[PDB]
């Protein structure tokens, strides 16, 4: 008997609305018979406080108006429809299902047989119809308040920094802060810790100029991780593509999430720093059949999902984690574009990092969308703006297969990180293949962008080693995982330095920070934008294991040890950040000027291009670059010279011409005199496993 | 030393050309480094007897001539490449693997841990490599002599019978003739057994134009299956797609194969009979990772394969298999319309039947093929003439998704066999949904093909339930398949007319044979092409197992028991048969002319038309058909009255205008004398679950 | 392949026109009196109906079985890629040639393009492809 209204099909989900005096409610669904508006008060999550029949529709589109309701407003849906599994129809109304379309979940899922849809338990497994009631154990969906101050004018609008002038930092929102004990214990390892004062002079400090954090869409532990006492800690399973992690919230999980996200988002761009947020498209947590009930699959299985065709009770997985969006339905193409759309306007992220990105392209070819989902990002008024990071794809017969990519579209160069590493581990190289790494990688990057920067170069990433783990290990040590060492990339291409683990043997430590030294300049010397492991500074380690996706403790968590050798590395990643940002030499759009040498100081003729190399030697020459980004003004920078000495042996290098300056060096050891500058050709005796950068000071 | 040439690339496989005195090789690989050719002598199969090193190579295809080898000889090969599986990469040329070209195949695989690749075994899995020779266990790929005396002349040009005039019969090769035990036991079940003389007079007796053979194409027994004691019995996992299958060979698996198949063909042809094949090539019989590496994976994995993209080790599965062809890459396609050609031009079969052809629809679409294979099929001269048939599937938006469809395209209505299952079950179903299906279905087909007999009408076949099973059985009985029952369809609207399975009650077998008769009537009534199951007119029973796949042996056999019960069936099905084709009525070209009834004998207005109904009544009214197929002479059929009753109750139907006669009825009793002829609108009390066929005789 | 001898609308009846017009030509939209022009010849032919393109790969297999000819140059090559993207054909094309057992293994000779949205537009090419270098002359020309 209350004043319910139709209310509106748009926006999508829970809107607040201050004129009107209450909420408008909306959920997409084709298949449904009936949908259910479930309201709960805070102090019971059991049963719902009022149900609500959502009786208005227009089209594929259920909506109420409800008076009175206010953000903080906790609510849930239940979903009526056919249940015959093999025809792809899942509808269980007793499984309280997550909006698709919430700003705001309050809180972890409970593992309980009864958030499934099936019987257990049973033994025809998925095509049984569990009766009981799953709200007790899901979190609710909440109302928000969408109104945020935003004072990060100056940044938002709107030139901020681009591609050629970014230094990534791939950093977890809690591993960063939740031993950075000079932080209150209720803020350590969250969004407002991270954006905390210390913490963003520390950043920039260090230099880096654009974050990279990892999955903040609010994610789910696999029901094996938490049988096993280890959560989710990578974020890689969304079930929701709009609401910030409720794990990472320092201020609760009932807009506290939204808000405190919001906050250090806002302090970032304050600072000068740039938000990239790591985002899965590919598969939902709800999993494969067998998997739980949890919003989309309740929603409406049929759409939402690609299924079997013949047999429609399975999912396709093109991710081998058990299922993929159906995208070829408006609906869902409207989700992910939606998302995209929110985390921009309404969260102020500056662009996105695809994971599994390859996968996200299959998928997106798999039912004809992968060119408009490209058309779709390329035209948008706020999409076609924001920084877009993947990974190379040939796809299925297979190059990109895709007119045209966006401005600011970058992939991970994977290629890049092995080339790398083999080279610095004594591996010969061709001479061109280490040199095209160096140079930003034209030959994959033919006409995919036209510019270096399209290339993301990096040593280490939350995939595998880190840059201590590289240096320092053979292999990986993933016991801890409980997959009994079956888990993680296996091809590392590392180098323990000679002992396994940590060692005394300072014959040994001295190799390492030899050679995290040499990865650190060999990054921050090539063209293209570099991405650096937050950790690899402070020497993290996670001893030894490369793919801690579910350690949510010790091993992971970052390390504020003042330890002197750390301390001296951090000073060195410092230095070298600067360095690189300091020289547009190392920052050039149209590569897509170079002089490569030889031991014997020469030119670089065939041959010497095509045989397996040990040594790089090669100069930055010239300096008329276009300019800077102001009205016409061409600056120079100065020339230098690169050498990488890879060879685990001394090698007798003679110099090119004019003075040469030594700037910077992975020598440990103190500089001889002989060596900080060096003029008329006369040879210096290059240390094995060294690099080194001069500048050319006459004429 | 030998004398031996580069040869040709064209044709792939292995050539006999008899001026050149010898035998060209070829097959097709990308990746490979190096590839062998093994030649086995027939005394020996474990060891080649010799070994040659194809050095020649036209782009992507390996080749060499190599004289004096002949019609008959084995032979192998052994590929070469990387094995990296983690990058797809799965070459071991330890397993020694069939052509994909192979036009036979000598006998079976031999189950052992070395036809693998990968070792069992150990703990990484499909990570190992296992280097044991598989030869001993991998039939050998024969060389054939592709010349044959064809006098089917009078058939194969030109013009044989279309699918308006078709009525297709379902039959698995060996079950046929397995028991015909007036055939010498060498042949019983065999390709020459079915095409026999007393066999082509049989089918010739029983009035079936249109032979629809099991899959034909060289498969695989799944080791889990053999392990059981049970072989693959229907054959749906083809390891080759040009080889008749050597277990249904009664001269021998040298040639024998192929010679006894364009035998039998021959034969049917003679006979007036058409010859379709049901074809599998949405997966191989290799299956995902962990299956054998028996060709293609051995061959060329990266292509011929859909791999996950960023896990190269593992396979997409659209069937449920574990495997999917790589239908993108020029040579996969290839294979698949080289297959189709090479069974219309060298093996005479007159068209296909695609096995999960909504999966290989998925999988075309998948990488952007299916509208492209559809034009492949049309414009070839060859492959646009032969019948096609499938099922529907709407992909994924999804409606066909396809500018044009063969002129003799055709899809299996399981939307027709449901309804009528259904409707002769007791379930009153809406009047224009019972009603459409049996005017062919214009509902479905809008703008599909324009005619009724793109609908392939049946009410059983290989999956589910035989007709007898169907009306003696309310859930299946699969415990013999070892799958705990878990396997097969649940939805199969059957009813076991009061007893399950045998019974003594003569009230039950009375329901039955009266119901049989009833769909019997119903599927040779109804517009579109009818397809019958193969031993339904001899009653055949699997004894409430309804997905016989695995059973190869007294359930599934063709029992030719001279029952006095089961020869007045098959009496039954002959009359109806022949009925049918005698009566151009019940097969028009252009429907998408009748009128409906009530049971008070008036016309059928809305509400009547929408409301659920247990009775049909309606006329073929009409006759000049246009024509005929000759030059310019329309006949005119005689008009027909169709009254189904499924009311299990007794009921009293008021006839329309004229003078009627009944030609046929499932009544088992004997026919009153105010039955056999009927006028002026009098009533007849119709019996309960009865169907009747009258022809109007005045005015 | 890329036009036929009677032109635009005020075109000699010879043979398409008559036959079926609708079908065989790709007409203006909103006016069908009217025939779409790639070539600036007055017709093209609509490729998108399978038995027009079924007439080309016809004639080609003809010439080849039947006149023993070893290869094909087509004119106008870019046009005609860009009149087969029109309507979804080039790829479709492409693969029936490759796929043919005898049109894979004759030559084919075009011209550089680039259509609808950059590039070529294509997955694979036929194994003994090449192309009038249109511009290596406009090179050789001018040192």
Redesign the interface.
């Known amino acids: 008997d209350r004043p319910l209204r139709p209310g509106d099909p748009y926006p999508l989900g829970s809107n607040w609305i201050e004129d009107d005096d209450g909420v408008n409610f909306s959920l997409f669904s084709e298949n449904a018979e009936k949908v259910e508006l479930l309201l709960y008060s805070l102090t019971n999550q059991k049963y719902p406080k009022e149900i609500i029949e959502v009786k208005n529709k227009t089209g594929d589109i259920w909506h109420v108006f409800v008076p009175g309701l206010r953000p903080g407003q906790l609510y849930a849906y239940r979903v009526y429809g056919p249940y015959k599994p093999?025809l792809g129809l899942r509808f269980n109304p007793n499984k309280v299902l997550i909006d698709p379309y919430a700003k705001a979940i309050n809180g972890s899922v409970i593992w309980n047989d009864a958030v499934f849809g099936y019987k257990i338990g049973d033994?025809?497994q998925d095509?049984t119809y569990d009766e009981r009631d799953s709200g007790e154990y899901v979190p609710k969906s909440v109302v928000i308040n969408p109104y945020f101050e935003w004072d990060d004018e100056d940044f938002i609008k709107g030139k901020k920094v681009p591609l050629k002038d970014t230094v990534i930092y791939e950093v977890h929102v809690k591993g960063f802060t939740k031993l950075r004990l000079d932080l209150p214990e209720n803020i350590r390892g969250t969004y407002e810790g991270l954006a905390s004062e210390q913490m963003i002079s520390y950043l920039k400090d260090l230099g880096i100029t654009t974050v990279e954090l990892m999955p903040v869409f609010h994610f789910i532990d696999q029901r094996f991780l938490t049988d096993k006492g280890l959560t989710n800690y990578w974020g890689y399973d969304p079930i929701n593509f709009f609401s910030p992690e409720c794990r990472y919230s320092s201020t609760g999980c009932l807009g506290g999430q939204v808000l405190s996200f919001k906050k250090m988002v806002n302090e970032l761009h304050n600072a000068g720093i740039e938000v990239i947020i790591d985002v899965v498209y590919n598969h939902t947590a709800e999993g494969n059949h067998l998997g739980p009930t949890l919003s989309f699959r309740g929603i409406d299985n049929t759409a939402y999902y690609?299924?079997?065709?013949?047999?429609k009770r399975?999912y396709?997985?093109?991710?081998?984690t058990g299922n993929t969006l159906?995208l070829?339905?408006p609906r869902v193409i409207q989700m992910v574009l939606d998302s995209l759309r929110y985390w921009v306007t309404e969260m102020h992220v500056d662009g996105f990092r695809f994971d599994?990105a390859?996968?996200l392209?299959?998928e997106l070819?798999?039912?004809?969308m992968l060119?408009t989902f490209f058309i779709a990002l390329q035209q948008d008024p706020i999409l076609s703006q924001v920084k877009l990071i993947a990974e190379p794809?040939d796809?299925?017969?297979?190059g990109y297969q895709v007119?045209?990519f966006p401005y600011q579209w970058a992939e991970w160069n994977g290629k890049y990180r092995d080339s790398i590493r083999r080279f610095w581990r004594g591996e010969a190289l061709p001479y061109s293949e280490i040199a095209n790494r160096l140079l930003g990688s034209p030959d994959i990057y033919l006409?995919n962008n036209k510019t270096p920067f399209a290339s993301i170069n990096y040593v280490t990433s939350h995939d595998g080693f880190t840059l201590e783990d590289l240096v320092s290990y053979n292999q990986k040590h993933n016991e801890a995982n409980g997959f009994?060492n079956?888990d993680g990339?296996?091809?590392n291409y590392s180098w323990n330095c000679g002992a396994e683990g940590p060692t005394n043997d300072q014959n040994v430590v001295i190799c390492r920070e030899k050679q995290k030294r040499n990865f650190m300049i060999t990054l921050l010397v090539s063209q293209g934008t570099p991405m650096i492991l937050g950790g690899d500074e402070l020497s993290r380690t996670q001893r030894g294991n490369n793919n801690a996706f579910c350690q949510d403790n010790e091993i992971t968590w970052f390390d504020w040890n003042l330890d002197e050798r750390k301390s001296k590395f951090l000073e060195f990643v410092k230095k070298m950040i600067q360095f690189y940002r300091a020289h547009p030499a190392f920052r050039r759009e149209r590569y897509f000027d170079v002089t490569f040498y030889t031991l014997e100081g020469r030119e670089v003729d065939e041959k010497t291009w095509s045989s397996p190399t040990q040594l790089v030697i090669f100069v930055l020459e010239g300096s008329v670059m276009d300019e800077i980004n102001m009205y016409g003004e061409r600056i120079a920078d100065d020339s230098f010279l690169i050498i990488l000495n890879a060879n685990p042996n001394n090698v007798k290098v003679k110099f090119p011409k004019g003075k040469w300056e030594l700037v910077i060096s992975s020598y440990l050891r103190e500089i001889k005199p002989e060596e900080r500058i060096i003029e008329g050709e006369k040879e210096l005796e290059i240390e094995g496993r060294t690099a080194l950068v001069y500048r050319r000071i006459e004429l």
């Open positions: 093999e033994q025809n095509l690609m299924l079997q065709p013949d047999n399975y396709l997985d093109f991710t081998g159906n070829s339905h599994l390859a996968a392209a299959r070819y798999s039912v004809n060119n794809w796809v299925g017969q297979g007119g045209n006409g009994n079956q990339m296996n091809e």
